[PDB]
Design a protein around this motif. Structure first.
Motif, PDB file in Angstrom:
ATOM      1  N   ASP A  84       0.706  -1.323   0.017  1.00 16.57           N
ATOM      2  CA  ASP A  84       0.032   0.045   0.135  1.00 16.57           C
ATOM      3  C   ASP A  84       0.916   1.324   0.116  1.00 16.57           C
ATOM      4  OD1 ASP A  84       0.818  -0.518   2.573  1.00 16.57           O
ATOM      5  OD2 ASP A  84      -1.028  -0.500   3.554  1.00 16.57           O
ATOM      6  N   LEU A  85       1.892   1.413   1.009  1.00 17.30           N
ATOM      7  CA  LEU A  85       2.683   2.624   1.083  1.00 17.30           C
ATOM      8  C   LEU A  85       3.561   2.752  -0.143  1.00 17.30           C
ATOM      9  CD1 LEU A  85       3.707   4.794   2.731  1.00 17.30           C
ATOM     10  CD2 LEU A  85       4.992   3.398   4.116  1.00 17.30           C
ATOM     11  N   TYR A  86       4.329   1.711  -0.767  1.00 17.45           N
ATOM     12  CA  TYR A  86       5.218   2.115  -1.542  1.00 17.45           C
ATOM     13  C   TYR A  86       4.605   1.629  -3.101  1.00 17.45           C
ATOM     14  CZ  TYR A  86       8.337   2.710   2.128  1.00 17.45           C
ATOM     15  OH  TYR A  86       9.187   3.302   3.315  1.00 17.45           O
ATOM     16  N   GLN A  87       3.404   1.182  -3.425  1.00 14.19           N
ATOM     17  CA  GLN A  87       2.852   0.846  -4.534  1.00 14.19           C
ATOM     18  C   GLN A  87       1.356   1.780  -4.643  1.00 14.19           C
ATOM     19  OE1 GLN A  87       3.144  -3.361  -5.541  1.00 14.19           O
ATOM     20  NE2 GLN A  87       5.251  -2.859  -6.027  1.00 14.19           N
ATOM     21  N   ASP A  88       0.460   1.036  -3.797  1.00  9.07           N
ATOM     22  CA  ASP A  88      -0.795   1.419  -3.918  1.00  9.07           C
ATOM     23  C   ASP A  88      -1.351   2.774  -4.011  1.00  9.07           C
ATOM     24  OD1 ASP A  88      -1.214  -1.453  -4.464  1.00  9.07           O
ATOM     25  OD2 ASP A  88      -2.043  -1.854  -2.677  1.00  9.07           O
ATOM     26  N   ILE A  89      -0.834   3.548  -2.980  1.00  9.92           N
ATOM     27  CA  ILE A  89      -1.231   4.873  -2.590  1.00  9.92           C
ATOM     28  C   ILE A  89      -0.954   5.975  -3.674  1.00  9.92           C
ATOM     29  CG2 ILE A  89      -1.458   4.339  -0.235  1.00  9.92           C
ATOM     30  CD1 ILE A  89       1.012   6.496  -0.074  1.00  9.92           C
ATOM     31  N   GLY A  90      -0.056   5.578  -4.675  1.00 14.86           N
ATOM     32  CA  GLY A  90       0.339   6.507  -5.807  1.00 14.86           C
ATOM     33  C   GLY A  90      -1.022   6.629  -6.629  1.00 14.86           C
ATOM     34  N   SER A  91      -1.777   5.538  -7.222  1.00 15.43           N
ATOM     35  CA  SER A  91      -2.889   5.776  -7.843  1.00 15.43           C
ATOM     36  C   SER A  91      -4.096   4.836  -7.703  1.00 15.43           C
ATOM     37  CB  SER A  91      -2.456   5.368  -9.224  1.00 15.43           C
ATOM     38  OG  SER A  91      -1.729   4.185  -9.424  1.00 15.43           O
ATOM     39  N   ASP A  92      -4.162   4.194  -6.345  1.00 17.03           N
ATOM     40  CA  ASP A  92      -5.390   3.505  -6.237  1.00 17.03           C
ATOM     41  C   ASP A  92      -6.251   4.153  -5.555  1.00 17.03           C
ATOM     42  OD1 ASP A  92      -6.575   0.261  -5.878  1.00 17.03           O
ATOM     43  OD2 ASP A  92      -6.366   1.398  -3.854  1.00 17.03           O
ATOM     44  N   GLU A 114       7.776   9.257   4.906  1.00 21.43           N
ATOM     45  CA  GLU A 114       8.660   9.831   3.663  1.00 21.43           C
ATOM     46  C   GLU A 114       7.661   9.529   2.498  1.00 21.43           C
ATOM     47  OE1 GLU A 114      12.724   9.475   3.487  1.00 21.43           O
ATOM     48  OE2 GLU A 114      12.932  10.566   5.430  1.00 21.43           O
ATOM     49  N   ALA A 115       7.215   8.438   2.449  1.00 17.46           N
ATOM     50  CA  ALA A 115       6.350   8.107   1.387  1.00 17.46           C
ATOM     51  C   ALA A 115       4.691   8.435   1.363  1.00 17.46           C
ATOM     52  CB  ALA A 115       6.172   6.343   1.120  1.00 17.46           C
ATOM     53  N   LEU A 116       4.328   8.851   2.386  1.00 17.66           N
ATOM     54  CA  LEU A 116       3.042   9.464   2.422  1.00 17.66           C
ATOM     55  C   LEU A 116       2.909  10.859   1.807  1.00 17.66           C
ATOM     56  CD1 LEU A 116       2.195   8.375   6.133  1.00 17.66           C
ATOM     57  CD2 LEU A 116       1.315   7.542   4.013  1.00 17.66           C
TER      58      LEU A 116
END
Ligand SMILES: O=c1ccn([C@@H]2O[C@H](COP(=O)(O)OP(=O)(O)O[C@H]3O[C@H](CO)[C@@H](O)[C@H](O)[C@H]3O)[C@@H](O)[C@H]2O)c(=O)[nH]1
Length: 326
Positions: A84-92, A114-116
Motif C-alpha cells: 500500500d505505502l510503496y505502490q498502491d497509494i500512488g494511484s489506487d 516520507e512515502a506519504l
C-alpha cells in the motif's frame, strides 16, 4: 476499557507477516483492552468495538470505509504494511481513501512517513515491530551459509537471489538456503531449476515458523532482496538472533537496519549481492581472526536489536490506543 478490533486481510493462521502482526498486537494490547482479530468488519460483534486497527490501506479498504462511515472522525488507525505505502497509494483510489479517512496512520519503520503525501504526515505514527530474541550461536568458519526467507512474489525480487546464486554456482564453500512458498507463477520453477543446477542453492519451500526461526538463527547471514517492504519480520528475526543481514537498499529495509548500515546492495544488483557474499566468506576465520565483514555487520545489527523488543512495541501501541480512544 476499549474494545479493539484488528482487521487483517491474511487468512486466519496463515504463516505470513499480516497474520503475525495482527496476532502479536492482539497479545500485546490484551492487558489494557479487549482485542480481537477479524478478516472483515462489521460482523455480529461489531457494535461493541470502539477502536479499529486495520492492516493494508487497500486490502482492508472496505472494512476501513465501513468503520469510517459508522464512526466518522473517531477510532480508526490504518496500518501501512508495505505494498500500500510503496505502490498502491500512488494511484489506487481505495488506498487513497483509507489514508484520508484514518485518524492515525501507522508505518512500521522511521522512513515510512516520507512515502506519504505531506498532508498525511501529521497523523502518521511509527511502530517498529518486535520479535522474541534467540541466543546468538557461535558458528563455524568452514563454509558460509546464507538464508533468505520470503514466500515467492515479485515484490520480494527473488530473481536477485537466483542470479547471485548462479554467479556463485561453482563455489562449494558458499551455501544459500531459500525458504518460502512457490507463490507468484513461474518463480518456483526458476528456483527449482537453479537448485537442480547449483547444489549450493537449495529452495526449501515453505517451512513452519518455528523451523524458519531456527534456520535464520543457524545461518551466518540473512539476505533480503525485496523491491519494497513495510518493515520485514525476517530482518527483525535475524537481527534478534545475532545473524547479520545483507539487504537491498530500499526504504523499508533502510528503516530497519539504519542509514549507516554497511550491508546494503542496490536493488536488483545481483553482482553487488554476490560480491558481498564473497566478502563475508573471505572474512571468515577462527576465533583468533579479526575484522571480517560479518563481524562489522554483527556489531551494527546488535545496535539495531533493541528496536525490536516487544516491551517497546507494546508501549508504542499503548500510546496509539490512547490516541484513538483518549
Ligand atoms: O516459509 C516461510 C515464509 C515466511 N515465514 C515467516 O513469515 C513472517 C512474515 O514475513 P515478512 O518478512 O514480514 O514478510 P511479509 O509476509 O511479506 O510481510 C508483509 O507485511 C508485514 C506486516 O504485516 C511487513 O512487516 C512486511 O514488510 C511485509 O512484507 C516471518 O515471521 C517469517 O519467519 C515463515 O515462517 N516461513
Amino acid at each position: 476499557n476499549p474494545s479493539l478490533v484488528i482487521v487483517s486481510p491474511a487468512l486466519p493462521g496463515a504463516n505470513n507477516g499480516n497474520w503475525r502482526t495482527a496476532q502479536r498486537w492482539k497479545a500485546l494490547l490484551s492487558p489494557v483492552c479487549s482485542a480481537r482479530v477479524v478478516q472483515q468488519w462489521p460482523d455480529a460483534d461489531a457494535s461493541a468495538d470502539t477502536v479499529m486497527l486495520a492492516l493494508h490501506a487497500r486490502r482492508s479498504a472496505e472494512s476501513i470505509a465501513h468503520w469510517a462511515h459508522a464512526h466518522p472522525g473517531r477510532g480508526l488507525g490504518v496500518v501501512l504494511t508495505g505494498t500500500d505505502l510503496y505502490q498502491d497509494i500512488g494511484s489506487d483510489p481505495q488506498a487513497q481513501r483509507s489514508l484520508q479517512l484514518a485518524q492515525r496512520l501507522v508505518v512500521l519503520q522511521a522512513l515510512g512517513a516520507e512515502a506519504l503525501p505531506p498532508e498525511c504526515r501529521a497523523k502518521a505514527r511509527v511502530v517498529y515491530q518486535s520479535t522474541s530474541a534467540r541466543a546468538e550461536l557461535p558458528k563455524s568458519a568452514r563454509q558460509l551459509r546464507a538464508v533468505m526467507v520470503g514466500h515467492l512474489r515479485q515484490v520480494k525480487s527473488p530473481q536477485t537471489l537466483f542470479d547471485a546464486a548462479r554467479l556463485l554456482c561453482g563455489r562449494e564453500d558458499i551455501r544459500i538456503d531459500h525458504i518460502g512458498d512457490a507463490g507468484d507463477a513461474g518463480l518456483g520453477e526458476l528456483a527449482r531449476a537453479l537448485a537442480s543446477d547449483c547444489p549450493g542453492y537449495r529452495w526449501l519451500g515453505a517451512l513452519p515458523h518455528a523451523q524458519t526461526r531456527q534456520r535464520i538463527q543457524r545461518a551466518h547471514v540473512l539476505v533480503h532482496t525485496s523491491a519494497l517492504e513495510g518493515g520485514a519480520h525476517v530482518i527483525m528475526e535475524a537481527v534478534r538472533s545475532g545473524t547479520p543481514v545483507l539487504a537491498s537498499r530500499v526504504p523499508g529495509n533502510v528503516g530497519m537496519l539504519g542509514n549507516d548500515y554497511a550491508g546494503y546492495f542496490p536493488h536488483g544488483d545481483a553482482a553487488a549481492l554476490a560480491a558481498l557474499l564473497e566478502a563475508c566468506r573471505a572474512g571468515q576465520g577462527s576465533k583468533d581472526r579479526a575484522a571480517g565483514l560479518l563481524d562489522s555487520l554483527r556489531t551494527q545489527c546488535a545496535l539495531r536489536a533493541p528496536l525490536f523488543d516487544p516491551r517497546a512495541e507494546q508501549a508504542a501501541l499503548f500510546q496509539l490506543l490512547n490516541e484513538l480512544q483518549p
